[PDB]
Enzyme design. Sequence first.
Site, PDB file in Angstrom:
ATOM      1  N   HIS A 116      27.306  44.092  39.690  1.00 61.93           N
ATOM      2  CA  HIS A 116      26.110  44.935  39.405  1.00 61.93           C
ATOM      3  C   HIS A 116      24.662  44.400  39.081  1.00 61.93           C
ATOM      4  CE1 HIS A 116      27.213  49.383  40.008  1.00 61.93           C
ATOM      5  NE2 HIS A 116      28.329  48.728  39.359  1.00 61.93           N
TER       6      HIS A 116
ATOM      7  N   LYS B  82      13.095  54.001  33.142  1.00 64.43           N
ATOM      8  CA  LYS B  82      14.201  53.165  33.067  1.00 64.43           C
ATOM      9  C   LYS B  82      14.321  52.476  31.824  1.00 64.43           C
ATOM     10  CE  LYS B  82      12.527  50.444  36.476  1.00 64.43           C
ATOM     11  NZ  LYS B  82      12.842  51.300  37.507  1.00 64.43           N
ATOM     12  N   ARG B  83      15.605  51.815  31.527  1.00 69.86           N
ATOM     13  CA  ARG B  83      15.758  51.216  30.309  1.00 69.86           C
ATOM     14  C   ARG B  83      14.766  49.989  29.936  1.00 69.86           C
ATOM     15  NH1 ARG B  83      20.990  52.031  27.791  1.00 69.86           N
ATOM     16  NH2 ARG B  83      20.014  50.401  26.349  1.00 69.86           N
TER      17      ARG B  83
ATOM     18  N   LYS C 262      12.542  43.924  33.943  1.00 69.90           N
ATOM     19  CA  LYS C 262      11.968  45.358  34.789  1.00 69.90           C
ATOM     20  C   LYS C 262      10.603  45.176  34.582  1.00 69.90           C
ATOM     21  CE  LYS C 262      16.406  47.878  34.103  1.00 69.90           C
ATOM     22  NZ  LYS C 262      16.436  48.493  35.305  1.00 69.90           N
TER      23      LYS C 262
ATOM     24  N   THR D 144      18.157  52.346  41.284  1.00 63.32           N
ATOM     25  CA  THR D 144      18.404  53.879  41.938  1.00 63.32           C
ATOM     26  C   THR D 144      17.332  54.696  41.463  1.00 63.32           C
ATOM     27  OG1 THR D 144      20.127  54.343  40.130  1.00 63.32           O
ATOM     28  CG2 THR D 144      21.062  53.565  42.189  1.00 63.32           C
TER      29      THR D 144
ATOM     30  N   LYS E 104      15.253  57.900  43.793  1.00 59.11           N
ATOM     31  CA  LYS E 104      15.037  59.216  43.377  1.00 59.11           C
ATOM     32  C   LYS E 104      13.672  59.581  43.605  1.00 59.11           C
ATOM     33  CE  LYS E 104      18.269  57.996  39.739  1.00 59.11           C
ATOM     34  NZ  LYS E 104      18.660  57.889  38.045  1.00 59.11           N
TER      35      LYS E 104
END
EC number: 2.4.1.1
Lengths: 809, 809
Positions: A350, A541-542, A547, A649, A653
């Site tokens: 992952h 998101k986290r 990120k 992901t 969405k």
Amino acid sequence: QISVRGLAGVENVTELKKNFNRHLHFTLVKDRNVATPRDYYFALAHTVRDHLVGRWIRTQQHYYEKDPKRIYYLSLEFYMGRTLQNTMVNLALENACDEATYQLGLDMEELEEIEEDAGLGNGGLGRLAACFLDSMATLGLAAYGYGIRYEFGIFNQKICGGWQMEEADDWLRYGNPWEKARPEFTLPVHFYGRVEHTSQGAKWVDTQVVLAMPYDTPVPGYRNNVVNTMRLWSAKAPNDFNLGYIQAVLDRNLAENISRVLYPNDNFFEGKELRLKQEYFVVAATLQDIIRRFKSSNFDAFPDKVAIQLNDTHPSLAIPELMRVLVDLERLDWDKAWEVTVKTCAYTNHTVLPEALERWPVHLLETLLPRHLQIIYEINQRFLNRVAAAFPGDVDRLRRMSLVEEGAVKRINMAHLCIAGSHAVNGVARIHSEILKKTIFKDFYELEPHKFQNKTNGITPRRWLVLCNPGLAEIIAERIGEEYISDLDQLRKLLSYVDDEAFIRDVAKVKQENKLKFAAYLEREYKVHINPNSLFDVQVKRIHEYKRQLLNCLHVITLYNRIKKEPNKFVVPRTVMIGGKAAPGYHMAKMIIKLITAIGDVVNHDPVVGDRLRVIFLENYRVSLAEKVIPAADLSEQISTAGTEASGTGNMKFMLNGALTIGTMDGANVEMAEEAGEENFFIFGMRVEDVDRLDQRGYNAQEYYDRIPELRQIIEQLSSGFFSPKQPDLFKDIVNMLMHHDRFKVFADYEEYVKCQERVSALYKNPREWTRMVIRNIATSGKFSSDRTIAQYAREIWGVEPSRQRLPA
Amino acid sequence: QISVRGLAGVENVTELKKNFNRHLHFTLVKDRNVATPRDYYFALAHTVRDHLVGRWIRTQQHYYEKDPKRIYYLSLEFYMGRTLQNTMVNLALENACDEATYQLGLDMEELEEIEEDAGLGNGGLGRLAACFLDSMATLGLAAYGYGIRYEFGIFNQKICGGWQMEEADDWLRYGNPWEKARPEFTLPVHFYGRVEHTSQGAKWVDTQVVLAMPYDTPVPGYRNNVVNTMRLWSAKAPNDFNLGYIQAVLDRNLAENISRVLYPNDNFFEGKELRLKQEYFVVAATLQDIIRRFKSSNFDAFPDKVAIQLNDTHPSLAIPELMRVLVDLERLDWDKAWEVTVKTCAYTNHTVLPEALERWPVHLLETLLPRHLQIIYEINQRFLNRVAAAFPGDVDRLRRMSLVEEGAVKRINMAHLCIAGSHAVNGVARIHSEILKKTIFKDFYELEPHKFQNKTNGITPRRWLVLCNPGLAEIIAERIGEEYISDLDQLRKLLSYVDDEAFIRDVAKVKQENKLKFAAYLEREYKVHINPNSLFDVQVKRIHEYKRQLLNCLHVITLYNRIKKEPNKFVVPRTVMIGGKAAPGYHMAKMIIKLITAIGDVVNHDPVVGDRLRVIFLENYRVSLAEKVIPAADLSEQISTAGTEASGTGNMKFMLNGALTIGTMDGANVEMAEEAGEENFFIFGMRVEDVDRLDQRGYNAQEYYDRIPELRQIIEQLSSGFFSPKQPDLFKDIVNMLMHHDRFKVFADYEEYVKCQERVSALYKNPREWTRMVIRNIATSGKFSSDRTIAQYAREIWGVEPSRQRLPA
Ligand SMILES: O=c1cc(-c2ccc(F)cc2)oc2cc(O)cc(O)c12
Ligand SMILES: O=c1cc(-c2ccc(F)cc2)oc2cc(O)cc(O)c12
């Protein structure tokens, strides 16, 4: 009301109402005079659960009769969210329940809100597991989700003084009507002890026993009458456990702590003993259950009847455990046992981030799982013998590929164990799978090229369209029918509607309705006032360095400074919404949350700004909040440094729900842009190759600071305390990382990000062209259905054929 | 089958069967192909629970409408046993369920055996609470049982090598279908903190909060359609509790330990903090609930609407707590608050033994409940002022009556608190109540003679006759009807049948059937072979010095020695059965268990003895075992030293079920003999007065040893290792206590016990005369119905009128 929600027949409705009143009386022990909304929710949940039961019994029945190959998805995380609406959707009960409840004078939507999320995951990995269960049920696979029933899921996040505070997620306080305890299938799991060697082999003795008690949750497929099982283990002490008296009883807690709480780290490895206990616990109980089922159908046929999919390395111990059972208990020889193991097990990676890699200290395994350690060393020795024969003389290869890492403390590389013991290793987007072959697993790839595959991630269009965005579901269905919900590629048909004035009107109307609803939800639940006419710019998101929420913060501050420079100039109004949890011990992630809120304090209270720019931190991002905010979004922020986000992901969405994407060529972003056409995507920033070029010569952040006046101003505002007037040095750690220790090259992408953000605003000025591009996105989002993903797993890893045929009702 | 079990109508039966199959499918998620006996038990339990619901809702409804005075029975212990059969009995569903299950191919009796006892008590006190709930429901009182839902009840007892071993009683593992969680009625309980004094009074601040979550269990009355509530609190942590992260979640355990485990001491005080926590927890949650109900009907009317009965001193903190709420929160003045408290609260004393008296160290109360301590001191001061005015100059009286005991550590005498703060104090048998007035509470009695009452204990003829002994119930009902089950005095009518040949035949037949069934149960469950023709000599109760199991051991050894002396002489054959739990830390009690088993090892394996004498230790004595063994008994052993057993209730159970009693004039034994006539009771040993005479001059055990050759031989066998050949000194502690430190004067009663035991054997040789005496016992057992007891409480303490009128169905 709307067609995709199914029929509300007279009989159906009458029946649901009778059963609702039966449950209120008999199950909940309440009359209509004392019942609270929570009772009403519970009565409905039981009523819907009733519709699952026959299907669940028949499906399990059917699998026994037909004896197909069984898929076992082993995950430490299942991020399920709420179950009620999803169940109704999959059983076609939604309109009937809406009607039935309406007639009892109740609002089904208000009842839905009372359900706790099952927040048994952190983020992408856990949600992938949930989407997979849905798809596996929809594709008629005899598949079982196996995990841990944590008493506490991901913590509830509160903001206090702009800081994240964590609260226990006590999701079971009021009871879970969806699970069924199965105490009769309780199994022993062993820990500690020591290994005796005898005449007939090794014996693991003097162990401590924890019991694993299973809870089963139904997983309904979409309108096929298939109901699969999610089995989650709870830890329980044996009754002779410890057995002055009182203390012995109170010490039962020690053992049951195993299933107590989800570790809240996303893409971060923390080597704590309790975490290893959880990993072994789920693996040991799961494998006994798998083998038991198998023997109620010689080990040669095991892989013809069993596939075990490992969701990351978290359940890597399944490999040594299966060996242990086959060799020590079943008395197979090593080589046969190994053949069976490899042919059974498959590993999904992952992330490539080094801090996520599970590297367990040997002293820990030695104490807790002494037999597993011996088996791991035996695996290592035989593996390295194969490497030496293939690459004679390549001593460096030997140490690089070892399952055992030399050093300060010796550690086991669990990812190495997984590749060695699996017939297939997949990454989760094409670019990620390529990187696995080029970089971190290059050696393994050169040894066994056949093991390495790609299985691009997906999301279930049930939860992520039909359920959360019924209005979009409906206008699609008006033109092209309902078949797309279980065959998402059919969305391509929407391309013939890109110049339809009515369809353009509908798409934009649904978006607008979603924004009004969300804006209202903000005011009701969190007393905040947002202009619904603004562009909704969302990053959910986290919280992570990789990120690059910080890159978004820089853009936000830039718009602010531009407005102040020229207050009387038009700018496309934006609401910037950022949300996500930081891991409790991730200081930087916690500082970023605080920075976000501190920007809001300045921006949201500036009279000159007006409703032109709003910055909102969305508290407690979780599955049920994603269902609300994603349909309401215009612009999806997918802005990880190239090469860091394996897939994502979230990206998918939003594509499905009518937002345009601003993103780097990272993860599945590359495939999304390829599916839609680059001209329909806001691509910016370094590619993978660019990042590597920068690393070769060295990343000097100062160069950027020196050359971009706009950027310098921001860093100075940060430093001087513009954003923190009472604690001027509050953000020193942030400035410092950005200037001297930024692994993720925020400054490198800043200039291209801002320019590309200008192109977004320009297109938003033209509603028709905005909407036309949105249509091109939705219309090409088909590939990103988890139905596609799972059919790829089934065919190319598990060796089973999916099916869309209904079981009988 | 039998008439007292009710009608099995065609409709009833069909209906139960439908609901059974509905629960199996929908509730348990099972088809008939995979179901285990446990599933079947559960399906039946749900089916019967369904019949309670409407009645439960209507009864609670009725109490709201009519607003009667409410009785609150506060106990730390409710020894409920199994619920299924009791529910069926009270709803008249027993035959219908027998039939319904039979037709599904199931044996209801086998299903009943799968139910765990709710063993939420130690012995007499806890069982009294259970019998009381039954009677209060049967007499239509608006009564609520309030306690703690312990996760672990009284430990399961195993014998290993003749020693007691304790195992956790995990009675909730498989779920409890009888309880309904009520999370919406969750209440905060406070601990620790400190007291600030302000302008407007004392303020308890900086406390730790534990939540109390209630679980409600229905308490059905006998055929009156009344269903009352037992509300038990479970401890739960608040979600901000502790809130690095993981440890904070794991530490939630600390708080929830409060409701984790029942302290397993019978008539013994252990001053542990956790125990004080339990005492306050049940009191604090209960009082908030009482007051809330009351305000949904000024504090002047509180005692007209509320009675609080304290089951021993365990909930004595209700007195300072009620003051605290009235004074600190409701702002009443001291004197009014006090008036209200006294008029509300009533105290039942259960023992005079000094080691049972709760005397809490002040430092403990200081830390845990600082405000309660201040209030206790204020109560003490005002109380002693009243004493000084009544008895001027009597300084000794002042220190004797103080709530605060000076000494090493200062302690609070909780019994003193109870008398001071209660309008009524009762003992539990006439002789016990007399002793309270003559000895330990003489001073209190002289001050407030009006407070002191007797309420002789009783047992419910539902559980203790109809349920456990249907065959006796039936032959009684054949002659005199069914009315006696709720009006036990009617048993006197059986005196006109004492010379009826048929009734004599029936009584003896039922006894014989009960013995065959029990003898079979022994072989099946514990591989032991007993002659059913022997006299069944049973002593079942907690293991204690005061209860004098050791005296029974001496008798057993005497018969053994007599047989060996003269092997070829006739003796009435006996099975001596002794059973009960020792508190885990009560060394002597644990040695007595071992002595019992050691005698068995010798006696049961002696060829010369044959089946003439058998000694059986009955493992895991609990409510459901009492239901089996008591109907099977011929001779009830009630042999406590005079003045030690406050009442006993075992005694009454056996009288009701056709055993004759050998006992001392102790507890309710005195009233039982008075009801039956001394000529129908095997009375032996010192009276109270005799014990006092012996104490005045000093108890010299040696005198007995020197004068009774039979006794000397036994002590020598014990000492020399006759009973323990491998550890010759095993029983040194026992010989030593008997010779030098026997508080209970075992030797003093030995000679009279043996002679009286000879009279028992002589009557047993004459079946007809045995049975005639049995009839005289059953026929006069009416007084010992808890219906009588509760009607006395209602009229003379609570100020409410009982009723036998049916609520509508
Ligand atoms: O949850 C965490 C994630 C990360 C992280 C950093 C950089 C990456 F690239 C990826 C993950 O770092 C941490 C450091 C800590 O000291 C404690 C933590 O809980 C974390
Ligand atoms: O449960 C107990 C009961 C008694 C007892 C003794 C004599 C009486 F008269 C009454 C009770 O003594 C104990 C002593 C201990 O050290 C530990 C214990 O658990 C107990």
